[PDB]
Amino acid sequence: YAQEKQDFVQHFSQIVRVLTEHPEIGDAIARLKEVLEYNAIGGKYNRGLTVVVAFRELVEPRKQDADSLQRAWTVGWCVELLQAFFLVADDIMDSSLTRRGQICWYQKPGVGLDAINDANLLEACIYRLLKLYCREQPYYLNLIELFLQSSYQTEIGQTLDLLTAPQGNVDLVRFTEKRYKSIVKYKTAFASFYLPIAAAMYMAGIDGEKEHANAKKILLEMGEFFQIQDDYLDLFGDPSVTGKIGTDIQDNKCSWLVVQCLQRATPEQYQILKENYGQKEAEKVARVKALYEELDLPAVFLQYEEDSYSHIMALIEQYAAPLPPAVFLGLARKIYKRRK
Amino acid sequence: YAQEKQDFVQHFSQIVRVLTEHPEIGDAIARLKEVLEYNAIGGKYNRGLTVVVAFRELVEPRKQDADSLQRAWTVGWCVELLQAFFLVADDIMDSSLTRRGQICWYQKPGVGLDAINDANLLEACIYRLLKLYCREQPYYLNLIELFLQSSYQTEIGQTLDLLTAPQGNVDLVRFTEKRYKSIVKYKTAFASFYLPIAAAMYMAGIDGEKEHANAKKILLEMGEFFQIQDDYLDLFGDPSVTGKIGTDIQDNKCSWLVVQCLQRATPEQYQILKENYGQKEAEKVARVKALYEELDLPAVFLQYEEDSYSHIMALIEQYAAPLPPAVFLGLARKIYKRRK
Numbered sequence: 186y187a188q189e190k191q192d193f194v195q196h197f198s199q200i201v202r203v204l205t206e207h208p209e210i211g212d213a214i215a216r217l218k219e220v221l222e223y224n225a226i227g228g229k230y231n232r233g234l235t236v237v238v239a240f241r242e243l244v245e246p247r248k249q250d251a252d253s254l255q256r257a258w259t260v261g262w263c264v265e266l267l268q269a270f271f272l273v274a275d276d277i278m279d280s281s282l283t284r285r286g287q288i289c290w291y292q293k294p295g296v297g298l299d300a301i302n303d304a305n306l307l308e309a310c311i312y313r314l315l316k317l318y319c320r321e322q323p324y325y326l327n328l329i330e331l332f333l334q335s336s337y338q339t340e341i342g343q344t345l346d347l348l349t350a351p352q353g354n355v356d357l358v359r360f361t362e363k364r365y366k367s368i369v370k371y372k373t374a375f376a377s378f379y380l381p382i383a384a385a386m387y388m389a390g391i392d393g394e395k396e397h398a399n400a401k402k403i404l405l406e407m408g409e410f411f412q413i414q415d416d417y418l419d420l421f422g423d424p425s426v427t428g429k430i431g432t433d434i435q436d437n438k439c440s441w442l443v444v445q446c447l448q449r450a451t452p453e454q455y456q457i458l459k460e461n462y463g464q465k466e467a468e469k470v471a472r473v474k475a476l477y478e479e480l481d482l483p484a485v486f487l488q489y490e491e492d493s494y495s496h497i498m499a500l501i502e503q504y505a506a507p508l509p510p511a512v513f514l515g516l517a518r519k520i521y522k523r524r525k
Numbered sequence: 526y527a528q529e530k531q532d533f534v535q536h537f538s539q540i541v542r543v544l545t546e547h548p549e550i551g552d553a554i555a556r557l558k559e560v561l562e563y564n565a566i567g568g569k570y571n572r573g574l575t576v577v578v579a580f581r582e583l584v585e586p587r588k589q590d591a592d593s594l595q596r597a598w599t600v601g602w603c604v605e606l607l608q609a610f611f612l613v614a615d616d617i618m619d620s621s622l623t624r625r626g627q628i629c630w631y632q633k634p635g636v637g638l639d640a641i642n643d644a645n646l647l648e649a650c651i652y653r654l655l656k657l658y659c660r661e662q663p664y665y666l667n668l669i670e671l672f673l674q675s676s677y678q679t680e681i682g683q684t685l686d687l688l689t690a691p692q693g694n695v696d697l698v699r700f701t702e703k704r705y706k707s708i709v710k711y712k713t714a715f716a717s718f719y720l721p722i723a724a725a726m727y728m729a730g731i732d733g734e735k736e737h738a739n740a741k742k743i744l745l746e747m748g749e750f751f752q753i754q755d756d757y758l759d760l761f762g763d764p765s766v767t768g769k770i771g772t773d774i775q776d777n778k779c780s781w782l783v784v785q786c787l788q789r790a791t792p793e794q795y796q797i798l799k800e801n802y803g804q805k806e807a808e809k810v811a812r813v814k815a816l817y818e819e820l821d822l823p824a825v826f827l828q829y830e831e832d833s834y835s836h837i838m839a840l841i842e843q844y845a846a847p848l849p850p851a852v853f854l855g856l857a858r859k860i861y862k863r864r865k
């Protein structure tokens with residue numbers, strides 16, 4: 186697994202080389218290399234690795250030649266670039282301080298709001314790689330449309346996330362279970378969970394609408410759990426482990442935690458949450474954290490993680506066939522009980 | 526021409542309807558409609574109109590059925606959406622105040638840096654329209670790749686533009702004719718001039734590499750002239766006419782004007798430019814404008830506009846064949862002597 190991660194990371198130098206190969210644009214290409222090095226490295230590479238692992242499990246080993254395997258790790262890196270693009274942009278919009286153990290790319294002196302165009306370049310690099318390696322393949326168009334559709338779905342999710350979290354406005358009424366499930370389905374589940382398995386499926390020749398629908402049932406549910414864990418870690422995670430500083434409380438976000446708080450709060454506790462949520466004051470944030478702990482939300486999260494795991498396992502039993510259950514089980518093992 | 530513009534604008538309501546048609550995403554789709562209405566309307570629609578006019582001139586009238594014409598005005602609107610995406614993002618990065626006679630979308634109270642995701646949605650809408658109307662056409666993939674390549678080229682151009690214009694740093698050494706030509710080729714010429722004619726060419730079945738190369742020779746030169754005019758208007762244009770407020774001097778930009786100033790300045794005038802360029806102080810900006818006027822740069826621009834027009838006309842004579850010269854002449858007439 187760590188050796189699998191290591192093999193995937195060793196292909197990054199080739200990805201950068203092929204993307205940063207007209208002398209007039211030299212300075213811009215040198216900036217793109219810096220944008221790639223800073224923002225596509227430091228994560229867990231779960232999405233990129235899922236493409237590589239799923240491709241190997243879905244394709245007959247006699248058909249896994251050197252060019253086929255290169256295409257698989259390249260498409261894995263395309264999914265990492267999609268993630269990099271959204272994170273660079275999301276860190277500006279969320280006013281975040283750190284990412285993957287280092288200062289946010291936009292927080293770097295000399296970068297600032299120029300990171301908007303840098304994010305756009307990362308997105309552009311996906312289609313440059315798809316054209317360079319997969320142009321002659323029968324699944325080329327299926328991959329292009331899958332990455333474009335995954336970006337649109339993420340952007341729609343980001344729009345819902347930002348509309349539910351207006352700055353300077355009390356938004357407790359908007360923080361419902363229904364709203365939450367809708368935000369996380371689009372902003373996380375589609376591109377972080379459906380996209381990597383769907384890409385390996387199209388590369389394996391599995392283009393069937395019914396097969397993709399079945400994979401989607403498992404993967405969108407896994408994505409919802411993953412975002413619930415991300416919301417828990419925003420406040421109760423170790424920043425030395427998570428690599429990022431939480432901002433959901435200050436940013437008035439429709440977090441899984443605030444939705445649970447609102448379902449369990451007394452009128453007195455509702456007032457405390459109303460007066461202290463969505464504000465930059467450190468003592469107001471500390472007051473919301475104290476309310477969550479009073480309502481035993483960390484324990485409520487532990488019980489949800491268990492119930493959700495069993496539910497996802499039941500969905501693998503129902504919808505994995507005819508794909509190897511290991512395709513979905515490998516990703517479940519990688520995200521369950523994770524504190525990073 | 527104004528009737529042609531009117532026919533094109535009358536199709537916008539249909540574009541919005543088809544793009545803003547899952548009740549859970551309702552609030553986000555309502556935000557997308559607001560993003561579309563605010564940012565894709567108010568311009569001159571030259572790019573969108575060029576697609577429609579070029580398609581009509583390149584396709585035999587017996588092959589111009591109702592569905593074919595709809596595809597043409599839809600692809601015209603895709604080019605307007607590409608422009609909208611880049612302008613929303615460019616206005617944030619350039620710290621601009623107004624656009625198309627109204628306050629910049631990001632300057633709107635309640636929008637702010639959420640405009641980054643709004644720009645991404647506008648870009649996403651291009652591929653949604655291409656899929657909705659052109660998916661079954663033989664040129665579908667050619668159009669997808671052309672819009673993706675045009676975005677990458679624009680982003681590379683924007684990177685060069687921002688690298689040459691660092692905030693708080695004296696960048697006069699970097700402002701060369703060579704650097705300028707490179708920036709404007711990528712940031713403007715490819716997507717504003719090559720993209721609309723190339724799209725109509727692929728829709729007409731003209732996919733030949735040599736035909737696209739010849740069209741490119743004319744159109745990249747036209748794009749350079751158009752950006753030189755844009756730089757002139759940034760300072761010497763009427764904001765009631767241009768619809769936007771200039772920021773090139775304050776933003777330390779490699780403008781055509783500053784390049785010309787540096788070629789004509791004495792050591793005393795160079796010192797004046799060095800002490801006053803790239804700064805927010807109104808009196809420093811007024812000092813640079815006074816230097817430009819002392820060096821008769823508005824007259825130097827008038828002489829360049831004439832010389833460039835003749836050169837572009839000579840390029841149409843050389844490279845228009847076998848395409849109707851009217852394809853290129855119509856766009857030249859629309860941009861030459863324009864003060865908007």
Ligand SMILES: C=C(C)CCOP(=O)(O)OP(=O)(O)O
Pocket residue numbers: 227228229230231268285372373377411412415525
């Ligand atoms: C979609 C969300 C929850 C953002 C972070 O994803 P990861 O937690 O997988 O971050 P990296 O490993 O890529 O850094």
Ligand SMILES: C=C(C)CCOP(=O)(O)OP(=O)(O)O
Pocket residue numbers: 567568569570571608625712713717751752755865
């Ligand atoms: C590529 C540059 C010069 C930006 C503005 O283009 P236009 O001057 O054509 O602006 P609109 O008509 O679309 O508003």
Ligand SMILES: [Mg+2]
Pocket residue numbers: 275276279281
């Ligand atoms: Mg965030």
Ligand SMILES: [Mg+2]
Pocket residue numbers: 275279346
């Ligand atoms: Mg966010």
Ligand SMILES: [Mg+2]
Pocket residue numbers: 415416419
């Ligand atoms: Mg989070």
Ligand SMILES: [Mg+2]
Pocket residue numbers: 615616619621
């Ligand atoms: Mg600008």
Ligand SMILES: [Mg+2]
Pocket residue numbers: 615619686
């Ligand atoms: Mg600009």
Ligand SMILES: [Mg+2]
Pocket residue numbers: 755756759
């Ligand atoms: Mg300008």
